[PDB]
Amino acid sequence: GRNVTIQLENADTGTLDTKSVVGLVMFSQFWYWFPLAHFLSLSFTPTTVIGIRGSDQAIPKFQMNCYAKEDAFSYPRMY
Amino acid sequence: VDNMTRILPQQSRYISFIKDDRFVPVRKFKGNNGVVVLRDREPKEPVALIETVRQMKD
Amino acid sequence: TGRDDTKETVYISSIALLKMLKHGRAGVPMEVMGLMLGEFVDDYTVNVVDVFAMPQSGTGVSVEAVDDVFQAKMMDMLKQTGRDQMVVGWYHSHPGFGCWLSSVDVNTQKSFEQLNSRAVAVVVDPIQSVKGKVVIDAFRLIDTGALINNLEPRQTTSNTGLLNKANIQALIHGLNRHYYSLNIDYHKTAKETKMLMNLHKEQWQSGLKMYDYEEKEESNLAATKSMVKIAEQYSKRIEEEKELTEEELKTRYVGRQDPKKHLSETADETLENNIVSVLTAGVNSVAIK
Amino acid sequence: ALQLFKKLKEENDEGLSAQIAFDLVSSASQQLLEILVTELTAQGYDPALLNILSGLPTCDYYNTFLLNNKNIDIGLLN
Numbered sequence: 459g460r461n462v463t464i465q466l467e468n469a470d471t472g473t474l475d476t477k478s479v480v481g482l483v484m485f486s487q488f489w490y491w492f493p494l495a496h497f498l499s500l501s502f503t504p505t506t507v508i509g510i511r512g513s514d515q516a517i518p519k520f521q522m523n524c525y526a527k528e529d530a531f532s533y534p535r536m537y
Numbered sequence: 538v539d540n541m542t543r544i545l546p547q548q549s550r551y552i553s554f555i556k557d558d559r560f561v562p563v564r565k566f567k568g569n570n571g572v573v574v575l576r577d578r579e580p581k582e583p584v585a586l587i588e589t590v591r592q593m594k595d
Numbered sequence: 596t597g598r599d600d601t602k603e604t605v606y607i608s609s610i611a612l613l614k615m616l617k618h619g620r621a622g623v624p625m626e627v628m629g630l631m632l633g634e635f636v637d638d639y640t641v642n643v644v645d646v647f648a649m650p651q652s653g654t655g656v657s658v659e660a661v662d663d664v665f666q667a668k669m670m671d672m673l674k675q676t677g678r679d680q681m682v683v684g685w686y687h688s689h690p691g692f693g694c695w696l697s698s699v700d701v702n703t704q705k706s707f708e709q710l711n712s713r714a715v716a717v718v719v720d721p722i723q724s725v726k727g728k729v730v731i732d733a734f735r736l737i738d739t740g741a742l743i744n745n746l747e748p749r750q751t752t753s754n755t756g757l758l759n760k761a762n763i764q765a766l767i768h769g770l771n772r773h774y775y776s777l778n779i780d781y782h783k784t785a786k787e788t789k790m791l792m793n794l795h796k797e798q799w800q801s802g803l804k805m806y807d808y809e810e811k812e813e814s815n816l817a818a819t820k821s822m823v824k825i826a827e828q829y830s831k832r833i834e835e836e837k838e839l840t841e842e843e844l845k846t847r848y849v850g851r852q853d854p855k856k857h858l859s860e861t862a863d864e865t866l867e868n869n870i871v872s873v874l875t876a877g878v879n880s881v882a883i884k
Numbered sequence: 885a886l887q888l889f890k891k892l893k894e895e896n897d898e899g900l901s902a903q904i905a906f907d908l909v910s911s912a913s914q915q916l917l918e919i920l921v922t923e924l925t926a927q928g929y930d931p932a933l934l935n936i937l938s939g940l941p942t943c944d945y946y947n948t949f950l951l952n953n954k955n956i957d958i959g960l961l962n
Contacts, residue, residue: 459954461543468911469546470569476913489755504946505570507544507552510906512563512574512899515941517541517587517948520560523553524538531548533955541949563899571910572942574903591944 460533462502477501541587544570600746601639601753602775603715605684605733609783611643616729618648619688619721626656626688630666632673633683635713639753641683642782643717647673656687657699658706684715684735693762694718694732696773704736704773717779725761732759735774742772750775805875818865825861828854886923889933905936914939 468475481501484494511518538544544552549569554561559582560575567573577584611631619627629648635641647669652660673679685707687700696704696716707714717733724730737750759776760766770776795801832854838844845851885908892901909917921937935941 459950459956461950461953461955470567470571470907470911473911475911476915491753504950505544505546506542506946506949507540507549507570507573508945508949509540509554509560509573509575510902510945511560511577511584511586512902513577513580514592514898515902516589516592517945518560518575518577519585519587520540520558521555522538522540523555524544524548525551525553526548531545533543537957537959542953563903567907572906572945574899574906576899587948589941589944590948591941 461504461506463505464501465503465505475503478503546570599638599752600741600750602735602750602756602777603635603641603713603733604639604754604778604780605641605643605715605717606780606782607643607717608645609781609787611646612781614646614648615686615688615719616721619690619719622651622688622690623722624691625651626690627651628656628660628685628687630682631684631686631715631717632678632680634680635683641713641715643683644680645678646686655699656703658703660703661706682711683713684711684717686717686719688719688721690720690722692720693723694720694730694759695762695766695769696734701736701773704734708736731779732757732770732776733779734770734776737772737774747771747775754778803875803879805872805879811872814868815865818861822858822861825854825858829858885920886927889924889929890927893929901933902936905933906942909937909939909942 465475465478467473467478478501481498484497485501488495507522509518509520509522510516546569552566552568554566554575559578561578563574563576618629621627627648629646631643631646633641633643633645649660649662649665654660670679685703687703689695695718700716704714704716707716713735715733715735717731719729719731721729737747741747741750754777757776757778759770762769832850835844835848835850838847888904892904917937917939921934924934924937
């Protein structure tokens, strides 16, 4: 989906992120027992700005300005 | 850019909620990705909404 | 069924290893054999405590060599020492070939599989071994039904396994068809290690021992005088040191037969000798009086 | 955090409260939140607060996001 990243640590608070750590140590071992890769799921966190209208806790459709080059920050190239 | 689409950390820097719209954050933007609460200036107007799966449950 | 059929990593103890080397080198080039006594744990950890040896027969390792009389007699004696245990496989040596089971050895193996389902055959090649680390491979037969339907991935589960490629395609095919080679690892104890390590009871004597003195004088003169002659050759060497490219000098005027290297070697060799000599004699003199 | 929420008891607004709690659930440890609700109960705190801090909102908002907005190229998988 190309919309998930792996956070080394939380960047909002500057505090090491438990899930992510735990995910990575199993992921690294996959020779011994091969299912363990799947635990990398824990380290995958969505990063997006989602505006939420506070007055009932639902998702409003509105538009934001972002001053940027449009073309580069398109989703990665198709094949 | 539309709401509810992937904003990178390096595009987060160049964000501005527009002044045309009637949504202004309650308290200034985080400056980074995550859930941001908006104040609706006028809650009497109909809003085009995406009803959450969570709203359905509650 | 679900049976992993995880192939045996053979944890061969340090004692087992030395005994097999010894048996095998003496029989060179005829094939030597005897059986492995051990215990099998887990589903892949076959622990070989020790081996016992079969008298060498004229047949170069065959099912005939398995003689019931020899076996009964040897095992009953090991009962009295409590050193009777289960047969977990057989060793043999191919010393005139690299590690791999031929047809004759495959029939030998086959009788072994009925006996014991996780019987291994560990081939010790003890002289041609391309590494300093004794090239040894472990094999176990895999049945044809399973191979044809490619259950072979199922046999290699839970083992990283080990790569044997030196006979390329042929080697690979043979290995697979036989059983699949697996890691061989060494379980040693620190009691065993210490014993191997000490190998000189006359350490205490020999370092206080100094050489009779007529031989020291002789040697010193030889060493100085000899270096006078390798100095003349040194002078020749550095007449040159002008040809374009160091390497070209070595080919064109036959720069090898290098005086530099002989003077450096000699000087250091004589140097250390004299360090020990002055130390030993001087130590003796004060300690004892 | 417990004290912050006691000050918040009298400053309660639908927007405000959602803001503080939404900020806290995302970065903060799964373990930290579990113990935290436990004590908020014993202050006697309303059930709304407790639902935001279960993590139920944010998980739902993310599911939707990624689902709709997928940019997978199917030839790669094939």
